[PDB]
Every structure is written in C-alpha cells, then in structure tokens.
Amino acid sequence: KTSTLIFFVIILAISALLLWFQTSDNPVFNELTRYMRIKNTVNDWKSLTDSKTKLESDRGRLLAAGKDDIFEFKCVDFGAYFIAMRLDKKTYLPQAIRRGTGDAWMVKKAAKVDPSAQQFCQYLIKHKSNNVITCGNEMLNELGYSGYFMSPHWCSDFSNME
Amino acid sequence: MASLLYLILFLLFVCISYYFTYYPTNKLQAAVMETDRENAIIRQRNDEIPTRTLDTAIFTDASTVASAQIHLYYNSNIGKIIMSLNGKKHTFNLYDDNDIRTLLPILLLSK
Amino acid sequence: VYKHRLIVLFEVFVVFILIYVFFRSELNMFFMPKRKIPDPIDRLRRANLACEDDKLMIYGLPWMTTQTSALSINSKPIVYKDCAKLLRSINGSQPVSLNDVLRR
Amino acid sequence: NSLSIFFIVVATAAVCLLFIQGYSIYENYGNIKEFNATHAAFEYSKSIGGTPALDRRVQDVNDTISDVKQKWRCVVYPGNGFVSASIFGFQAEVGPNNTRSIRKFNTMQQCIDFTFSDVININIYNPCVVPNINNAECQFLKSVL
Amino acid sequence: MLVVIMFFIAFAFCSWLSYSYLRPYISTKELNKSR
Amino acid sequence: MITLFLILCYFILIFNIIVPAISEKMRRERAAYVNYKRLNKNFICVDDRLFSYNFTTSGIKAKVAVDNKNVPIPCSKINEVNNNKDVDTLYCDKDRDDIPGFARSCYRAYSDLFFTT
Amino acid sequence: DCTISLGNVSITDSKLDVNNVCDSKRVATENIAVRYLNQEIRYPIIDIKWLPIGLLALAILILAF
C-alpha cells in the first residue's frame, strides 16, 4: 500500500521534471529536436545536391571557355520574371542577385514585354549586386533547398531547357 | 461495467496520444506535412510519364511515319511535357488543344 | 475508490478543456478531406487513337465533342493509307487509352 | 505471474533506454551542437509554401502591380534625352511658378537610378488631364506605353 | 485520501510551472493592447 | 491498481504531451505573428490575394480581404487596403467552396509566416 | 580534330570512361581517385517524443504492485 503510493508520487515527480525539461526552452531539448529534423533533411538531400552541384560546376566550366563576360550580371528572362544572373568565378555555378536573406530577386512581369521589370533588374545589377546566391550547395546550406529539384526554379533543369 | 469504462478511457488515452504524437498540432507542422504530401503527389505524377528512352512512331508529315526514339520530361506543377527527339526539345503545353493533338499520337503509338 | 474515479474524470475533463481551447481548428482540419491538386493530364487519360477510313482520329476527349483529328509534328492532319495496319501492329485490334500507356 | 514479468521487463527496457540515451547525449552533445550549427538551414526549409523563399523585409513594387501601364519605365524622348513615363504621366519637377515640367535625363542609367531609387520622388505630370494638356506629349505618352 | 492530496499538489505545481513558462506566449492581451 | 494507473496515464498525457504541444505551438505562432507585425503592413500579398493575421488564445489566424460580393481583392489594390480600416475579411478557418483555390491560398498564407522560423 | 558521338547510353552498377584522347597525354587508367570523405557520424538518439511514452512504460509497474 505504502510502496504503491511512493511509486505514484515518484512517477508524478518524474512527470514534473520532464514537463520542466520540455517547456522551459532548455538547450538540450532544443538541440535534440533540431538534430532530429536536421539529420533527416541531410540524409535526404546532401549527397544528391553535392553530386548535382559538381556536375553543374563541370558544365559551367565547360560553358565559360572562350567567353569573357560570362562572369558579369546579365538580366535573364525566365518567362514570368527577371533574374540578375552571372556565372560564379570560383565555382563556375549560376549566381543570382539575392533578395535579403531569401532566394534570388525575381522581378515579376505584368506581361510578356515589361520594360519596367527589365530596368529594375538593371538597377539591381548596378546597386543591389553585393548580395548573391548560388545554386546547389550554397543554396542548400542557406535556404534548406538546393533548387535543382524544384520546378519552376531558375536553378532547375526543366526551367532552363524550356 | 468498471472494466468497460476503464478500457474506454485507456483507448481514449491511446487515441489522443497517437494524434498528438503523429499528427500536426500547429501551423508550422501542418504546413510542413502538406508540403511533403504535395511534393510526393507531384513527384509521382511526374514519374507517371516514362523518362527512359521510348520508341514511338512519329509522323514527320501528313502521310509519312518514321520510327523514332524519344525522351519525355513531364512537369505537372506547370503542366508541360518536353520531348527530346533527334536531339531537339519540343515543349507541349497540356492546356493547349493543338499541342494535345500533336503529342497524344506520339504517346499512344509508343511501344 | 470513487474519489480516484472522480480524479480520472477530472483529468479527462481537463484534457477536453485544453483540446477545445487550443486545438479546435487542427481537429477540424484533420476531420475534413485533403486538398485536391489539379492534374493537367487527368482529362487525357481516356484518349485513344482510332482512325475512321484513312484519317487518324483521337477519341475519348470530353471537352471536344466533335471528332478531333491527330496532328503530326508540323501540325498537319494525319492521313495514312495503312492506319489500321499501323494501329494493329502497335497495340492490336483492341483500342488502348492513354491511361494504359502510362501504366505500362 | 507472466504479467508481472512482462511489466518488469518493459519498465527495465524503458529505464535502460533512458540511461543509454542520457550517456550518449552526454558524450555527443557538443558533436550535435556543431552538427546543428553547420546544418542550421536543414531544420526547416525556406520553401514551406512550395515556392521559393521571399524576404518580406525587402520591398519590391513589381510584386503587386499587375498592370504594365501603371509601372514606371524609362523611355526615349525624341531629341531631348530620356524620360520616366507611366500611365499616370511623366515624372516631373517643380516649375518657376510651382508648376510641373518634364524632367529629362541625359542617359538611361540616370533615368533608371532616379525612377527606381528608394527615395519617394513621384511627381505626376499627366499631359492628357484638363489642367495640363499637351497634344503632342499626350500622343507620345500613349504611343510609347 | 493521500493519493488525492498528492495528486492535487502535483497538479497544482505542474500547472503553476506551465503557466509561468507559457504566460508570455499565451497572454494575447499584450499584443491587442499594443498598436 | 488500474485506476491509479489511469491517473498516471492522464497526468502524463496532459503535462508531457498536450502542454508541451501548446508550448511549441504558441512559441512558433507568437514568433511568426511578431515577425508579421514587424512588417508594418496590415495586408500582405500571398498567392495573388491579400492576407492579414491576428493572434488569439488559440493561436494565429489568417484572414483574406474580400469585397462586398465575397470576391477576394487582388494584390494590385494592396495600397488601398492597408489604408482602409473597414475591410471585409473572410477567415481561413471556415472552408469556402465558392472561392476557387481558397484552401491553397490559406495554406500559402500560413506557410509564408514561417520564413525566419 | 577527333570526335565521339554516342547515342542512348544506359549503364547499371558499372563505370563509363569516354576518353576521346588525341594527344601525347596518357589517361591514368585504374587510378583510384580518393577524396577526403568528411563523413558526419549520425548518433543513436531516439526521437525525444519517446520520452513521455517511456515514462508510461515505467508507470505500468504500478499494475504489478
């Protein structure tokens, strides 16, 4: 009888301790939950992104042979928007002018022929070019997705062969 | 009597714990899980079209037919099929009647 | 002891209070069916090639009630002297829809 | 007494798993800390909506304007350089009597810098409105849009 | 009797902990009163 | 001792399953709401529609701006909706089959909240 | 001026090495290219959502009292 009550009280005390562990913004609790999410995402995407990034680095280093202005921002039309893209010197990967801490600055178009979007894109090239984003490993490490397996996207193969 | 009520309470416990463990309880979790579900749907729909090289009979004119080997890339998010034939990409919009009437004989004559 | 049963009932009451106060929208979203994502190729699944006389036609297209001919690469209506033989050599006498082609 | 043995073994399994997890966490807490630090973006992807990440803190006017004519562009004014034009009218400057006069830029880059700068410098000059009407300017504005 | 008292004591303590940890996040009056 | 076991189960349920769920939900959604309010915009453009959010004791709730005919206002009018004070709004909690793509729009509205978090 | 024009290549569990080499340089056959595998060791951390349920397991000892 007494032993049952003591075990009861012990279980309630352990429940209170676990409640404190869970609802007190503990560092260990937060790190364990973060690791549970991060491990699954890494297992899903990291190696595939690395292989794809190496392939496109090889492709862009082949493409950059004989061209001198391929490492300068040009405003590429992607149908529904403009993107200020160049080819990264170090990795020979597509690079685009970034919008804050998000993805590339996609200047939307209100029709097929939008002079204003083109001109704002040129303004970004002249002014907002200090912040850039790169497809593949950098995009995966900054935004959590690589962009090579999402469509439509300026890094994806379908949007670039269309 | 007592056993039935205790079993009912225990089953209610199990159901509530299962829901709170394996189902979304806030907007972040719900958004993440719906992202995953929509991505899986899109991926399987894209995988419906055979991405491996397939042999079809392609009419290069009104009355001339030739055997050819083509590759198909389907993107159901925007609804387009890109057919690589003779090294050239042909983009067919699935919302266009003429594109449908051109692509469907290619798909239905595959072997 | 009746007091312990009352304690269990009070705990169940508190559980229901918390669920009602906080997780009402989540439960309703859980009860309702999922959100349908449009399929661009769904309406083409019943399309089967079947040619009358020597002109290749496409059947099974619901939104185009009239018989729609089959176009070639250069967008010319297909007329073929041996359409029936070609269709027989492709799949056989029985017609094949797009759904059967996709499930191959 | 099978039920008692089953309860003992399952509770022992729970306690032993707790101790194993505690010791593994104790030895690998730092390791998972750097693993999370170097993979912070892998926790939640920025494409939760199924769309590329967008930074709402950086404001872009092109996201909402669904009409081309309402947008501001730089167009070539024949014989007088470049001007900023839209369906509302040309971007103007204060005249001698606090009026509106079309301001003209020497180069496309200057016009783009003035038009798309973060500074609010909008001064509408409609050449088709009643107070300020000019047939040639209105015709040019309507034709160039 | 002792079970009832112990359960109420632990329930009160755990409710106090949860309230103390979650008041800054569930007190929506602060957001409503702020414009 | 079945009843003491049931007391244990329900106590653990509440204080280690439901209350931590409330904690995580409120922390995430309060952070999202604060990030929203830092934008200083009453209505934001999500999925070609205008969405506002409010924080209540159940969490963060999204609403869409509509006109007198319950047709959502396009983003091109955002400047005249933020300045307005009596905008008719439809809450995303209640499903409406008359609006095309309402579920997707409300989904993307909730998803665009969690950019930083 | 030497070119290789392959068609539809489909290889499984194999290696493809198209060299198209037309100079004095000799390709390094069977030269195992080893990189630094900066492997990240996953740890046997069960999802801590197991923590309540495990407690319940301990709780059922009260059934044996």
Coordinates of C-alpha atoms in Angstrom, one line a residue, chain A residues 12 18-19 22 28 36 42-43 46 52 62 70-71 92 100 109 122 128 131-132 142-143 161:
Chain A
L12 CA 4.4 12.3 -10.7
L18 CA 10.0 16.0 -17.8
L19 CA 7.5 18.9 -18.1
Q22 CA 10.1 20.2 -22.3
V28 CA 19.5 20.2 -24.6
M36 CA 16.1 15.1 -35.3
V42 CA 20.6 16.0 -44.6
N43 CA 20.2 12.2 -45.3
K46 CA 23.0 16.4 -49.0
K52 CA 24.4 17.6 -58.9
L62 CA 32.9 23.9 -70.0
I70 CA 30.0 35.3 -68.6
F71 CA 31.1 36.4 -65.1
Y92 CA 31.6 28.2 -62.2
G100 CA 17.7 40.0 -48.4
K109 CA 6.5 40.9 -65.1
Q122 CA 19.4 46.6 -64.4
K128 CA 22.0 45.7 -55.1
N131 CA 24.3 40.1 -52.1
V132 CA 24.3 37.0 -54.2
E142 CA 21.5 28.9 -46.8
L143 CA 17.8 28.1 -47.5
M161 CA 15.6 23.6 -71.1

